[PDB]
Amino acid sequence: KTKEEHQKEVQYEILQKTIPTFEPKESILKKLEDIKPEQAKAQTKLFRIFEPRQKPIYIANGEKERRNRIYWKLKKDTLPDGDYDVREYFLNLYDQVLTEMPDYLLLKDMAVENKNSRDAGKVVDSETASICDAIFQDEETEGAVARFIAEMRQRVQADRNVVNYPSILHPIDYAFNEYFLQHQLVEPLNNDIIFNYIPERIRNDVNYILNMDRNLPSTARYIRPNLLQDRLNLHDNFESLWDTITTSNYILARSVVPDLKELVSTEAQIQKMSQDLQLEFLTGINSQAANDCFKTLIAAMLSQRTMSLDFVTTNYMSLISGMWLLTVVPNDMFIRESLVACQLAIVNTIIYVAFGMQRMHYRNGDPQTPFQIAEQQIQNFQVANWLHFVNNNYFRQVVIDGVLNQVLNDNIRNGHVINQLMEALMQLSRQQFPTMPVDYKRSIQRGILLLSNRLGQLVDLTRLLAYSYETLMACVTMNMQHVQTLTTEKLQLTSVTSLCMLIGNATVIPSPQTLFHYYNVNVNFHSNYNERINDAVAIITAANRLNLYQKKMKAIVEDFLKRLHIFDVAVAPDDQMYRLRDRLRLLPVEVRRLDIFNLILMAMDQIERASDKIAQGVIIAYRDMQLERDEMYGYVNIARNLDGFQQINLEELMRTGSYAQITNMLLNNQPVALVGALPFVTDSSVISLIAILDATVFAQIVKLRKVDTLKPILYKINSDSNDFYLVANYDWVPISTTKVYKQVPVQFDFRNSMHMLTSNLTFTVYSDLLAFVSADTVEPINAVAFDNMRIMNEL
Amino acid sequence: MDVLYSLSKTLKDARDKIVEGTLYSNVSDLIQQFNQMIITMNGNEFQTGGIGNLPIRNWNFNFGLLGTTLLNLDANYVETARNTIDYFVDFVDNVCMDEMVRESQRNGIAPQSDSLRKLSAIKFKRINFDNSS
């Protein structure tokens, strides 16, 4: 027996090590509750990638110009070597922008005074103020620009709740900030929005009195949750994840189900049951078990957790209770094996025996259940009609407010089928029971009468259970998809018996605060689910668009599952992880994330070119090429385009590992342009130029079969070069075989950088959205069900 | 009829818009529609013809969804799409001919061919796209 328990434990462990449910399934409640709405983020400073840097310039003859000028330079120049590394850097930048993307902006917070203003002007950022001061003071500024910086003014229209502030931003920075300003997530909030946010069924229920006792100012905002129904269909072919989801929802529902009050006296009921049963059974009957069964039934129905039935076939009292269980709870809520076991026990120990029929030889896997067979094999109207109702009693699927719901039959919602159940039980109690020993027959039929004589109490129990299920289901936001789960919740027929034999007369309904808490938890989980889907899809799509082929989407899927917070990611099976990746790869990207990605993808070329620690490639050209003359440096080997040279992609060369072509070209001195993000050595040495030191850096490629150590040489010959007398005092044309493919920085233009940013003057963003709803509950005694009659009417 | 029109419209857009080198943003919505069509039509069997000299034809659908993980379409993507498009176009052609060659004294507005009656089911409503014509 202990060996059998060990074997069952090891097999169940083999099964459970593939279900990502957390070890003690009580901590799931804490995890779900801790899931919170994403806090609205306010921008503290304008998003900037570039800043105006003052740099020296040189005359065409290579001499310093005594007049520095202002260019655009990256605020943080950290671009790496290699095209793949650059694209990875831009993926990381996209992720950072997504993380820090504001949900609303109030430019008045960022506004600062303009020192040189004649009209008490303000600018939108401290960086803007500093740049304006620098340009105002510098001597190369146009008089028009100076007078404009002095005269420029903001405009604060409180009557319209608007503010315009001048700003100075790079075009890319302005694109980012303008997108943030124009696409804020906040929306106006009113009592109408709060009222509609209250679930409709709760609003129409007469048991809850809801009032809007709070005043919402016009400048009140909120960020509405993203409650789009699940796009991954985790109920289709995701058995492990669906099992975990149903378990978590079951735990939450258990937390929110109310506790029964003033049950029948346990001692008195036990004494009467023992007297009636005359056991020449009563174990497990108590208030704890009754409450546990109530919560288990309601929560299992709410979460669609499959529940298995645990019982002893000898306990015909437990079978009697199970009759009511099957009458009131739809049959698809139980694992098929447990349902057929309970039904076969019931028929072959009560019903066929009472009617004198031969015990049924039920064949497992039969499309029909034992009750479906018995219904057409039994000629008694009461029993047959009860069996018919049980057989065709299932959940009915309805879409309410865009959410799929599993609805009950109106007969059990109002509790009328209990009357048919008691008709069947009374017939069985007065049945003859041919050939059965008389004392056992009497015990069975008195046990039947025990439940039959509770007709009113069981009607009250059924309609109370139905009402609490309806009210708690009005607070569910995701579709109530019904699936047969891997692991089932065990339900004790002894607990069902205790509930049936101890249910009293007091109506217990969810408190309005409990309903609002359940609804808030469901909404928070749903919105987190959708937002993490959006994050995962955005990252996967960005990686595929940037061609990060060495990117494992399993990491993204693991982060997705981890941030869902209810999954033990280490346990999810591998095929399901890859199915999840495949289904995420197919979803369209959310609009805000996609627009930000479009900004980054269109401006990443320019950002990389603006970088200072890397070049775009090196032309070798094996011939005397005159050094070009540039403002940024007297003489340089700057190539502004690779036209006329065969290109070898360094990234592809490195990936493929075959250096035959590049080796042949470097051996035979064939002009070629190596393309790729490379770091260069800046050399201000005329003698180094004469020594032809820029052509001695490619042999390592042939020697090592690697191109990550390639480091071209960029000559920078100026007046501040320590050898410029060689250029100045002799009649020669400086020349270098190699050229570096690099871009000159973008020059700072005040007119093209000065913008006007507009936003709202002020508003308050709320999050609870239900603290404004004051909800009271009618006195529980006179609380009516859906049919406008008291839920418990046996008082 | 609406579903058949949607199939034809989706195929025409696939042939027009799914071309080599096109930006994926130029096709993304059409690709979602096309994958919806493939999902809906997979696993169904159709039969057309048998009236007059119109040959009997049997149509089976088992196709993979078109990808959604490229920046610009390349030859691979176009080649993968073209075979599916050709089979679907032939299917639509034969369904249309089979429906055109039929008539009824009573309820002439109703679909007459087996393929179009099948398409009139509720499972096929997921492909409607846009009834512009």
**Other C-beta atoms lying within 10 Å of the C-beta of residue A739:** 27
Cβ contacts of B65 on chain A, cutoff 8 Å: 586
Mutual orientation of helices A316-328 and A336-346 as an angle, nearest 10°?
Answer: 120
Tell me which residue of A58, A48, A45 sits closest to A111, measured CA to CA: A45
Nearest CB neighbour to A588, from listed B28, B69, B70: B28
Interchain contact A233–B (C-beta under 8 A): no
Please give the Cα distance from B10 to A78 (Å, whole number): 47
Please give the Cα distance from A382 to A420 (Å, whole number): 7
Interface of A with B in 529-588 (CB under 8 A): 540-541, 544-545, 547, 585-586, 588
Looking at the complex, report in whole angstroms how far the Cα of residue A628 sits from the nearest Cα belonging to chain B. Answer: 36
| A–B CB contacts, 8 A cutoff, strictly below | 16
The CA R_g of chain B, rounded to the nearest whole Å, is: 16
Looking at the complex, report in whole angstroms how far the Cα of residue B70 sits from the nearest Cα belonging to chain A. Answer: 6
Please give the Cα distance from A28 to A568 (Å, whole number): 11
Would you give the DSSP letter of residue A347? I
Phi, psi of A127 (to 5 degrees): -60, -45
Q: Which residue of A has its CA nearest to B36?
A: A586
B28-33, Cβ contacts within 8 angstroms, sequence gap of 24 or more: B28/A588, B28/B68, B31/B66, B31/B68, B32/A588, B33/B127, B33/B129
Q: Where are the alpha helices (DSSP H) in A485-590?
A: 493-502, 512-546, 553-564, 574-585
**C-alpha to C-alpha distances, A752 to A145, A168, A746, A748, nearest whole angstrom:** 12, 9, 12, 8
Cβ contacts of B70 on chain A, cutoff 8 Å: 544-545
> Collapsing DSSP states into helix, strand and coil, what is residue A8?
helix
Please give the Cα distance from A3 to A506 (Å, whole number): 47
Residue A540: partners with Cβ closer than 8 Å, 6 or more residues away:
A553, A556, A581, A584, A585, B69
Q: Where are the alpha helices (DSSP H) in A566-668?
A: 574-585, 591-610, 650-656, 660-668
Interchain contact A237–B (C-beta under 8 A): no
Residue A784: partners with Cβ closer than 8 Å, 6 or more residues away:
A206, A207, A790, A791
Q: Helix and strand tally (H, E) in chain B? A: 4, 2
Residues A31/A34/A37/A43 CA torsion (nearest 10 deg): -120
Looking at the complex, report in whole angstroms how far the Cα of residue A700 sits from the nearest Cα belonging to chain B. Answer: 35
Cβ contacts of B71 on chain A, cutoff 8 Å: 544-545, 547
Burial pattern A578-587, b for ≥16 Cβ within 10 A else e, equals ebbbebbbbb
**C-alpha to C-alpha distances, A754 to A39, A65, A132, A158, A487, nearest whole angstrom:** 32, 27, 10, 24, 64
Looking at the complex, report in whole angstroms how far the Cα of residue B24 sits from the nearest Cα belonging to chain A. Answer: 10
Q: Which helix (DSSP H) or strand (DSSP E) does residue A754 occupy?
A: strand A754-760
Q: Select from A236, A539, A544 the residue whose CB has the most chain B CBs within 10 Å, as the one to mutate to test that interface.
A: A544
Q: Which residue of A has its CA nearest to B35?
A: A586
**C-alpha to C-alpha distances, A710 to A657, A678, A716, nearest whole angstrom:** 15, 7, 19
Q: Which tokens in the block code for residue A553?
A: 């989407």
Burial pattern A330-340, b for ≥16 Cβ within 10 A else e, equals bbbbbbeebbb
Looking at the complex, report in whole angstroms how far the Cα of residue B68 sits from the nearest Cα belonging to chain A. Answer: 6
Interchain contact A44–B (C-beta under 8 A): no
CB spacing of A586 vs B71 below 8 angstroms: no
- The technique by which this structure was obtained is cryo-EM
Q: What is the dihedral sign for C-alpha A677, A683, A686, A688?
A: negative
Q: Which tokens in the block code for residue A309?
A: 């039935």
Q: Which tokens in the block code for residue B50?
A: 């048998």
Let me know: does A169 contact A163? Beta carbons within 8 Å.
no
**Other C-beta atoms lying within 10 Å of the C-beta of residue A443:** 19
Interchain contact A660–B (C-beta under 8 A): no
**Other C-beta atoms lying within 10 Å of the C-beta of residue A39:** 10
Residues A214/A215/A220/A222 CA torsion (nearest 10 deg): 30
Looking at the complex, report in whole angstroms how far the Cα of residue A288 sits from the nearest Cα belonging to chain B. Answer: 48
Tell me which residue of A103, A104, A107 sits closest to A164, measured CA to CA: A107
Q: Select from B71, B74, B77, B126 the residue whose CB has the most chain A CBs within 10 Å, as the one to mutate to test that interface.
A: B71
Let me know: does A245 contact A238? Beta carbons within 8 Å.
no
Would you give the DSSP letter of residue A260? P
Residue A335: partners with Cβ closer than 8 Å, 6 or more residues away:
A306, A307, A308, A484, A488
Interchain contact A641–B (C-beta under 8 A): no
**C-alpha to C-alpha distances, B94 to A139, A497, B42, B44, B99, nearest whole angstrom:** 79, 64, 18, 16, 8
Let me know: does A490 contact A311? Beta carbons within 8 Å.
no
The CA R_g of chain A, rounded to the nearest whole Å, is: 39
Please give the Cα distance from A377 to A348 (Å, whole number): 13
> Collapsing DSSP states into helix, strand and coil, what is residue A167?
strand
Residue A76: partners with Cβ closer than 8 Å, 6 or more residues away:
none
Please give the Cα distance from B114 to B116 (Å, whole number): 6
Residues A502/A506/A512/A513 CA torsion (nearest 10 deg): -60
Token pair 């696939």 is at which residue? B14
The number of residues making up chain A comes to 795
Residues closing a segment before a gap in chain A (C–N exceeding 2.5 Å) = 280
Resolution (A): 2.7
**Other C-beta atoms lying within 10 Å of the C-beta of residue A708:** 14
Residue type, A500: C
Q: What is the dihedral sign for C-alpha A307, A313, A314, A319?
A: positive
Please give the Cα distance from A403 to B46 (Å, whole number): 34
Token pair 């979803």 is at which residue? A587
Let me know: does A42 contact A180? Beta carbons within 8 Å.
no
Residue A329: partners with Cβ closer than 8 Å, 6 or more residues away:
A297, A301
